[PDB]
Coordinates of C-alpha atoms and ligand atoms in Angstrom, one line a residue:
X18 CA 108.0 108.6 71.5
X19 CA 108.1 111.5 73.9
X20 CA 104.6 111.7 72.4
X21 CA 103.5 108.5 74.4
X22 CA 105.5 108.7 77.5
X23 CA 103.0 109.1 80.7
X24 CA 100.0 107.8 78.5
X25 CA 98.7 105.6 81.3
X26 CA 96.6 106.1 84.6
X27 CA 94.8 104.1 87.0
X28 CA 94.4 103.7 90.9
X29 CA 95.7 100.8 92.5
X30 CA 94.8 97.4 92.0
X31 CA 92.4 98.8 88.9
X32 CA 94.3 98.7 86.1
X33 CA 95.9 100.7 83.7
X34 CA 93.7 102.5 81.3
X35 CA 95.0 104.5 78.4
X36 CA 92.6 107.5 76.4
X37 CA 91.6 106.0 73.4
X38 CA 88.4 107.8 71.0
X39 CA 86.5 105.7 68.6
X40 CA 83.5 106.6 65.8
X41 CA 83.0 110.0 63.8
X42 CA 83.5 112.5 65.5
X43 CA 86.4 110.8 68.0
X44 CA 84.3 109.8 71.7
X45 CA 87.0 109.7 74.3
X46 CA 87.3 106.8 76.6
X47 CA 89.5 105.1 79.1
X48 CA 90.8 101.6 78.0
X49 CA 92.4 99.3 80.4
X50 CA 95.5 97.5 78.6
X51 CA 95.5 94.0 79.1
X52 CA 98.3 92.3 77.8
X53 CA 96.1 89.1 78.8
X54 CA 93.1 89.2 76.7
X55 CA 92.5 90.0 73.0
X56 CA 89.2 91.7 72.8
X57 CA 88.3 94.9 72.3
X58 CA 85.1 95.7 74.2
X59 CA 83.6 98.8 75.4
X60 CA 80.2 100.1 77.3
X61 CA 77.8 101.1 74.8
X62 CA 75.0 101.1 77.8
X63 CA 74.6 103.9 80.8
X64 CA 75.8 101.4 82.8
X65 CA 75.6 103.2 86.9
X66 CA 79.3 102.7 87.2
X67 CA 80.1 104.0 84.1
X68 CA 81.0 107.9 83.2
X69 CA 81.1 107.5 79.7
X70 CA 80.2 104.7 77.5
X71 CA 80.3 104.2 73.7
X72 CA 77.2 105.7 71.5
X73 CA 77.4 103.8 68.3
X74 CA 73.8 106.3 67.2
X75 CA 76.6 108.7 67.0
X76 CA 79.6 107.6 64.5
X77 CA 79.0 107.8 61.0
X78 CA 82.0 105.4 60.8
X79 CA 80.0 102.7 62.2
X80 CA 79.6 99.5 60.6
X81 CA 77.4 96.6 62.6
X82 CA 78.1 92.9 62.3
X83 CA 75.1 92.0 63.4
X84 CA 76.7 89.3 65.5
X85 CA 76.5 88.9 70.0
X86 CA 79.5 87.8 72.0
X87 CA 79.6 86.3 75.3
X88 CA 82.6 86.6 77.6
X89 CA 82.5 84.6 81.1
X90 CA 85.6 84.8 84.1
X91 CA 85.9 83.3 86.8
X92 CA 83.0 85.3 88.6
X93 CA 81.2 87.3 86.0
X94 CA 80.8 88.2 82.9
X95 CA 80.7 90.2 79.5
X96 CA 78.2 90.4 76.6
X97 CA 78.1 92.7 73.5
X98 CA 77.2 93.6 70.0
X99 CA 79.9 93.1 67.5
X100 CA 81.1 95.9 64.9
X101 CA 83.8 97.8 63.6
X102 CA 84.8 102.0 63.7
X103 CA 87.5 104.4 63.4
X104 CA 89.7 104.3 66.1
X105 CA 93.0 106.2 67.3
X106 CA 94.7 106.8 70.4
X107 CA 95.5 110.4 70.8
X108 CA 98.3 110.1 72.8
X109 CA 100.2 107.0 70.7
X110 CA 101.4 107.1 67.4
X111 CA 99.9 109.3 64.8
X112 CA 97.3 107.5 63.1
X113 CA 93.2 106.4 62.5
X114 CA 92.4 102.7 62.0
X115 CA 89.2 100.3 61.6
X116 CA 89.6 97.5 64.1
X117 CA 86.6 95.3 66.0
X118 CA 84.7 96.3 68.8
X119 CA 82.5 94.5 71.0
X120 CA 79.9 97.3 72.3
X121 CA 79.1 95.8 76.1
X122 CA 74.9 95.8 76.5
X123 CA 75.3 93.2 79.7
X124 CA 77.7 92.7 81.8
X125 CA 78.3 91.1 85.7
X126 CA 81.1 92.1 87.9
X127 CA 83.3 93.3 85.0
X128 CA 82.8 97.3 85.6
X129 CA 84.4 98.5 89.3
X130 CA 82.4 101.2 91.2
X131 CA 84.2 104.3 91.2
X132 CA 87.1 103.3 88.8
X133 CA 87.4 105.9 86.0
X134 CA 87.8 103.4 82.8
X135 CA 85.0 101.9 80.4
X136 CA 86.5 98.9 78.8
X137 CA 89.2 96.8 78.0
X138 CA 91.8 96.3 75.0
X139 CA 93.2 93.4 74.8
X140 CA 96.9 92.9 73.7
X141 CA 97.4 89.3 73.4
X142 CA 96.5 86.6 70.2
X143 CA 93.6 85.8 68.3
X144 CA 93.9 82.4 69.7
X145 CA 91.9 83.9 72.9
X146 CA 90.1 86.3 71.3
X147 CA 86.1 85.5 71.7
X148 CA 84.3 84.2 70.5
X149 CA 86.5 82.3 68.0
X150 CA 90.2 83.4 66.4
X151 CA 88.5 85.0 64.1
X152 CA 87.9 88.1 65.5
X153 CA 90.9 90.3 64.8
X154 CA 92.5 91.7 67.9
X155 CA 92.9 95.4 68.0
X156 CA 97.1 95.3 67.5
X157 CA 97.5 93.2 64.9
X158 CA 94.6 95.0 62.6
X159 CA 96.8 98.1 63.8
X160 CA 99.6 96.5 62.5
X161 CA 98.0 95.6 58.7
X162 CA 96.4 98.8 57.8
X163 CA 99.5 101.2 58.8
X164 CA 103.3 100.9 59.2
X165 CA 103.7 100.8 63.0
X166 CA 106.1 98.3 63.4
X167 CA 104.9 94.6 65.3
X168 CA 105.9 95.9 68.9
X169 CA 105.0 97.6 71.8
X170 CA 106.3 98.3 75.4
X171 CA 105.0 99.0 78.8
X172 CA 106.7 100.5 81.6
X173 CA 104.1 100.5 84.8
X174 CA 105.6 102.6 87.6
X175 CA 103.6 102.4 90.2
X187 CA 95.9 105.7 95.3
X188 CA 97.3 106.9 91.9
X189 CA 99.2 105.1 89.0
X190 CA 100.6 106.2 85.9
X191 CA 102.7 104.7 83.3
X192 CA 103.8 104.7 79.7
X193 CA 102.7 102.5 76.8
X194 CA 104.9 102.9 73.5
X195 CA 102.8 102.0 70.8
X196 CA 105.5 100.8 68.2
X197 CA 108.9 101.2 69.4
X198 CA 111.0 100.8 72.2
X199 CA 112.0 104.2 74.5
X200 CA 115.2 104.1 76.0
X201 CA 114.8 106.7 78.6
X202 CA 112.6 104.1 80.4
X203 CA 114.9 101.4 81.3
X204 CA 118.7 101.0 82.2
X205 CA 121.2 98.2 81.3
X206 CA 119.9 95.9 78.8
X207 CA 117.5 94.4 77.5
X208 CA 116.9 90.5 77.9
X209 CA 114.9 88.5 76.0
X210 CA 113.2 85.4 76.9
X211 CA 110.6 83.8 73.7
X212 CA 107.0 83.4 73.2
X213 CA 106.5 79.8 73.6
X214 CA 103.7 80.2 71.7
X215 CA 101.5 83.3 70.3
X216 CA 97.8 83.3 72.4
X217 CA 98.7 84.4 75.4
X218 CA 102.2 85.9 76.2
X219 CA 103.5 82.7 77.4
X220 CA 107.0 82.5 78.4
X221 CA 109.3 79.7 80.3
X222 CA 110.7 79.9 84.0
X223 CA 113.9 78.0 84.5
X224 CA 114.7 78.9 87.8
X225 CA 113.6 80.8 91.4
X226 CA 115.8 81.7 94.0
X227 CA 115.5 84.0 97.2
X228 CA 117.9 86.1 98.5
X229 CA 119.8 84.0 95.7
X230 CA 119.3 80.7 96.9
X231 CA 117.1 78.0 94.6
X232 CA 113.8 76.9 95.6
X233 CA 115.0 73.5 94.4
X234 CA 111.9 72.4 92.3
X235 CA 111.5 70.6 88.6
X236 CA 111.4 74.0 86.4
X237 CA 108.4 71.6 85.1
X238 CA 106.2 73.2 88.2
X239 CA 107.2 76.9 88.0
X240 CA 105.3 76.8 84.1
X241 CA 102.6 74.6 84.9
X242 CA 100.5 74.9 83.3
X243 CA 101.8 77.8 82.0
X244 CA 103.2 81.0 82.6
X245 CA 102.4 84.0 81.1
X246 CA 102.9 88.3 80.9
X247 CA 99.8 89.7 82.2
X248 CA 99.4 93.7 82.6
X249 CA 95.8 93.2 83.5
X250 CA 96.5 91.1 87.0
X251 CA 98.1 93.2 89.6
X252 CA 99.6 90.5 91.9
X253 CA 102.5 87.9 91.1
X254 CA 100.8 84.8 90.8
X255 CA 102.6 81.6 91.3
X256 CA 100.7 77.9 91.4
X257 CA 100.2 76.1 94.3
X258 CA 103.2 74.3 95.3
X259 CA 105.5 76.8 93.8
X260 CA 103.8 79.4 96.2
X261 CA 103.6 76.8 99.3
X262 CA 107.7 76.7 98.7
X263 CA 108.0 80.4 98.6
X264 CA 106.0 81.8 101.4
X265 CA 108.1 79.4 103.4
X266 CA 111.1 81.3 102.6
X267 CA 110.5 84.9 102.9
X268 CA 108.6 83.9 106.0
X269 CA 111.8 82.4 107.0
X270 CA 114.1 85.5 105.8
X271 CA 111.8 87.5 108.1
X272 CA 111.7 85.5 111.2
X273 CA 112.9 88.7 113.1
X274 CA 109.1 89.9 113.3
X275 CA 106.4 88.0 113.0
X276 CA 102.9 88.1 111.1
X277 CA 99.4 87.1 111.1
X278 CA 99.3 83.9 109.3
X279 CA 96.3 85.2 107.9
X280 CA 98.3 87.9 106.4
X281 CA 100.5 85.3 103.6
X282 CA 96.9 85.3 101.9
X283 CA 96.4 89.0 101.3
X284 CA 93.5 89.1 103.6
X285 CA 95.2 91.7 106.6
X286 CA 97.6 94.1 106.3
X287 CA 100.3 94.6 108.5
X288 CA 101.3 98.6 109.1
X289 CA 104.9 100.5 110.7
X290 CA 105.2 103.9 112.0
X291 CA 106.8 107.0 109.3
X294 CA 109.4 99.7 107.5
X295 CA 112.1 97.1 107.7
X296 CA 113.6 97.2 104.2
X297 CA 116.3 94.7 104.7
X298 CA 113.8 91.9 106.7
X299 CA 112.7 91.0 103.3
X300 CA 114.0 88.7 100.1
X301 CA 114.7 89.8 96.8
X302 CA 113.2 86.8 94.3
X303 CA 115.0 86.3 91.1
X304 CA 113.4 84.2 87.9
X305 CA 115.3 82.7 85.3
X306 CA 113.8 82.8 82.2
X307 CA 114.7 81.1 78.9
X308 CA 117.0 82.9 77.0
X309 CA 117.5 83.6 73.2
X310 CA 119.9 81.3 73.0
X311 CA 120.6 77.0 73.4
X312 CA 121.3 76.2 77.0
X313 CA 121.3 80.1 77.8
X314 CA 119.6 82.2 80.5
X315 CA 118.6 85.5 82.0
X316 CA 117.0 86.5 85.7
X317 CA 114.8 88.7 86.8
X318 CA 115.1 90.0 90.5
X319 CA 112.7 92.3 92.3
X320 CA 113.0 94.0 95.4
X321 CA 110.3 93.6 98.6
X322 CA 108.7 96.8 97.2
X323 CA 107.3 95.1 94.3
X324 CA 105.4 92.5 96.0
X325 CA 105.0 94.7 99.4
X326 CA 102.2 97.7 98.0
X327 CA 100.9 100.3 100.0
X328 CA 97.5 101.0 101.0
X329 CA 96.0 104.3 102.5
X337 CA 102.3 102.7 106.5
X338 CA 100.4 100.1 105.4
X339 CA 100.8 97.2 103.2
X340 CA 99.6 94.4 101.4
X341 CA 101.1 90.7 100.7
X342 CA 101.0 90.4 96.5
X343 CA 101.8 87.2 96.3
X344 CA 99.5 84.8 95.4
X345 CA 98.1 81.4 95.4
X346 CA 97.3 80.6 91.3
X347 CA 95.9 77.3 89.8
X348 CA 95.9 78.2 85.9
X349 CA 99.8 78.6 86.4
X350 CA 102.3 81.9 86.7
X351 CA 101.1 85.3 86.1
X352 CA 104.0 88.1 85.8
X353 CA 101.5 91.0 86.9
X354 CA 101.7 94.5 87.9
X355 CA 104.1 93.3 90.9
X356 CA 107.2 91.9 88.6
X357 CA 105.6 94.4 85.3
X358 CA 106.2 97.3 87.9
X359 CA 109.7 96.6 87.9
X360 CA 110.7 96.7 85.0
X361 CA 110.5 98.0 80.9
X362 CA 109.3 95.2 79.1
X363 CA 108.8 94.3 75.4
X364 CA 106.6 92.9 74.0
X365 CA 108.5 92.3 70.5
X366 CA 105.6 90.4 68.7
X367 CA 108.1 90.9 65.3
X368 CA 110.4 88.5 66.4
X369 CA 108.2 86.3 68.8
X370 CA 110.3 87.3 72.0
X371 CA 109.8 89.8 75.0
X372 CA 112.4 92.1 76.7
X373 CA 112.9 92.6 80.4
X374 CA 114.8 95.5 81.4
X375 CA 115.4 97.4 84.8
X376 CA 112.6 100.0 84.7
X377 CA 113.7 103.9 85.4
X378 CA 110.7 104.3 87.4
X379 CA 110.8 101.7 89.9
X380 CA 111.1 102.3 93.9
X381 CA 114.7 101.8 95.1
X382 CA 116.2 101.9 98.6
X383 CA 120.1 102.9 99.7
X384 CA 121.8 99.6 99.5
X385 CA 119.7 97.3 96.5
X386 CA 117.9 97.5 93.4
X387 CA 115.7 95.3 91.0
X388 CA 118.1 93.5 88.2
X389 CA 117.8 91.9 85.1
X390 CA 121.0 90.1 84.4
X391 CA 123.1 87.4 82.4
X392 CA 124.0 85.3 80.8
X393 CA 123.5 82.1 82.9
X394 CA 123.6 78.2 81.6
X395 CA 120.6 75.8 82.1
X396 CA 120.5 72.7 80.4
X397 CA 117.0 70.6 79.3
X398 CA 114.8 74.3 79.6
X399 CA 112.5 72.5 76.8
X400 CA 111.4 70.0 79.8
X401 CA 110.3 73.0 82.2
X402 CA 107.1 73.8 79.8
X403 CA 103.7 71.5 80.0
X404 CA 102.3 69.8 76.8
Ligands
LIG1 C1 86.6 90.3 85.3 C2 85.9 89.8 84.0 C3 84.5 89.6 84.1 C4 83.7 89.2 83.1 C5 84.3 88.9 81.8 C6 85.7 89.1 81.7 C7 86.5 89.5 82.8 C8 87.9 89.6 82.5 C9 88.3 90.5 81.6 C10 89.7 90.6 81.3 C11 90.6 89.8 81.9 N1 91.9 89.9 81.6 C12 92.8 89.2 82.2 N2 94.1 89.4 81.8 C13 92.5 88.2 83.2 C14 93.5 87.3 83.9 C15 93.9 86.2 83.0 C16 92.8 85.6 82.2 O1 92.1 84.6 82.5 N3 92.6 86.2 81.0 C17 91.5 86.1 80.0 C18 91.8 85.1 78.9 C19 90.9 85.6 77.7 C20 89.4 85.4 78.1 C21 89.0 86.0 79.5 C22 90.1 85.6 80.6 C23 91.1 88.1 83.5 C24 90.2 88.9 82.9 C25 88.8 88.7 83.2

């Protein structure tokens, strides 16, 4: 695995992308990994943004399946040509598989100006795969045509980024402590349950029903935390409150300014714990990150990454950045465990800690 570690880049706020090469010979491209999507989709167009893009005219490995996709968000969009090719990742394990790829021909406020990636891999299930289940997501044909075990890990550490992706195993150097793991609810997206939030250890005092509605979820490719409306009404409220001391452009609690100090009160700030569901009945685990998790520099300047949602929570880059986690597909679970990389300070660090008791965590999910 020392093979794999540092196997990530990006710049901040645009993703992690990881060298991947698909067709005959191998074409190299940046892939973002996306733990919440499940396609595999690259330019195949000189797209103006672009500084590579996929030549299917090229691979002798290429098979079409004469078939479109179509791929709207939120703003934008996404459409390609279906087919299949050889593809590796040259630094991940050691082998060559066939898997799917949507070659992108259109697209609308997908590709960013100036980034330095050219598509997307998507890590989550077949259930959200477009444009129906299916269309075999790249990990699990990974999975049937070699003997990489059903797991991988991500440790994001943080205008440049780098990280580590182990493709098949877990790295131990990465993390401290132990591992906790909380289960997939169900397997589409990486949906998980939140039981409990406190600040600076002290309960937000909702129904757990609210922190997972209408779900919650493990997403590498969203950088902020994202909680839903009333859960984040209810939080702003209290680090605003833990940070009386100064005060800030109310503005600011939306992301849109930027407040800046000379050569930074550490100490003004929260740490948030989660609970998540354990493995076991009536048994829990937290999650704790400091202010410099949801606190990111700009180019001392700094942004607010906490944010209004309204399709429910999103664990992004901001509590991912934290920590090593696991996505154990074998067993239907993921791990959290303090990341080696993340930024300290002299007095506290990010934890991930147990066991705790929580009765009726079946009740906190929506159905
Ligand atoms: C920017 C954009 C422009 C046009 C076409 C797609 C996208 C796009 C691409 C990848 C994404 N990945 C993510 N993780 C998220 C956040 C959560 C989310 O809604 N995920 C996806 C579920 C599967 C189907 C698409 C949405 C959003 C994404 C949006």
């Amino acid at each position: 695995f020392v093979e794999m570690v540092d196997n990530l880049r990006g710049k901040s706020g645009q993703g992690y992308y990881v060298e991947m090469t698909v067709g005959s010979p191998p074409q190299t491209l940046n892939i973002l990994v996306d733990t919440g999507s499940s396609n595999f989709a690259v330019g195949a167009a000189p797209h103006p943004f672009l500084h590579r893009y996929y030549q299917r005219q090229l691979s002798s490995t290429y098979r079409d399946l004469r078939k479109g996709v179509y791929v709207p968000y939120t703003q934008g969009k996404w459409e390609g040509e279906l087919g299949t090719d050889l593809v590796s990742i040259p630094h991940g394990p050691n082998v060559t598989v066939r898997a799917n790829i949507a070659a992108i021909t259109e697209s609308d406020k997908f590709f960013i100006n100036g980034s330095n990636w050219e598509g997307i891999l998507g890590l989550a299930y077949a259930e959200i795969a477009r444009p129906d289940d299916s269309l075999e997501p790249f990990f699990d044909s990974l999975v049937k045509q070699t003997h990489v075990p059903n797991l991988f890990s991500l440790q994001l550490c943080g205008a440049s980024v780098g990280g580590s992706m182990i493709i098949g195993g877990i790295d131990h150097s990465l993390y401290t402590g132990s591992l906790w793991y909380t289960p997939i609810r169900r397997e589409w997206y990486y949906e998980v349950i939140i039981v409990r939030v406190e600040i600076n250890g002290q309960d937000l005092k909702m129904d757990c029903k609210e922190y997972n509605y209408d779900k919650s979820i493990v997403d590498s490719g969203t950088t902020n935390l994202r909680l839903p409306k009333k859960v984040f009404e209810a939080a702003v409220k209290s680090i605003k409150a833990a940070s009386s001391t100064e005060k800030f452009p109310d503005g600011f609690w939306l992301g849109e300014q930027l407040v800046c100090w000379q050569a930074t009160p550490w100490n003004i700030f929260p740490v948030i714990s989660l609970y998540l569901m354990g493995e076991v009945t009536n048994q829990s685990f937290r999650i704790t990150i400091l202010p410099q998790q949801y606190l990111r520099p700009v180019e001392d300047c700094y942004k607010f990454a906490i944010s209004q949602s309204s399709t429910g929570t999103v664990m992004g880059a901001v509590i991912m950045e934290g920590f090593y986690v696991v996505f154990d597909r074998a067993r239907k679970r993921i791990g959290f465990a303090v990341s080696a990389c993340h930024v300290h300070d002299e007095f506290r660090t990010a934890a991930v800690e147990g066991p705790f008791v929580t009765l009726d965590m079946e009740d906190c999910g929506y159905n």
